[PDB]
Amino acid sequence: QLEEVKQASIKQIQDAIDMEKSQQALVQKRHYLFDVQRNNIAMALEVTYRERLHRVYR
Amino acid sequence: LDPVQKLFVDKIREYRTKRQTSGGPVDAGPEYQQDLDRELFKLKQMYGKADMNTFPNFTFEDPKFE
Structure with a gap:
């Protein structure tokens, strides 16, 4: 009797937890990215201006 | 520029005898001119080459993005 009830509880909260955790990630990572x-991008651009002043002036 | 006055009279006036003429500074000296022309071009070759009486303005660029 006891077994099947506990098996369903484990699987149930599992799919919950994983689904909200999977969800939270995709936002944050991508905000990340x-x-x-x-x-x-922008890095190389300033730099190129930067070094270019070097190069041309020389 | 330096000293002894009888010898230097021979030379110090001869510093400026050269300078005391300026179209061929009592001698520019054809040899001086020839080797000058050699070294002045050769110097130019030994140099960078982008004319030295011109301003090298700028250039522009666009970097790798995916």
Whole structure:
């Protein structure tokens, strides 16, 4: 009697927990990525201006 | 520039005898001119080459993005 009830409880809260945790991640990671993606761009640009002043002046 | 007055009279006036003429500064000296022309071009070759009486303005660029 006792077994099947406890098996369903375990599986039930599991699919809950995992689904909300999976959800929380996809937002945050991607907000993540957006940080970086702009960054990786914009970085090289300033620099190129920067070094270019070097290069041409020399 | 330096000293002894009888010898230097021979030379110090001869510093400026050269300078005391300036179209061929009592001698520019054809040899001086020839090797000058050699070294001045050769110097130019030994240099960077982007004309030295011109301003190298800027350039622009666009970096790798995916």
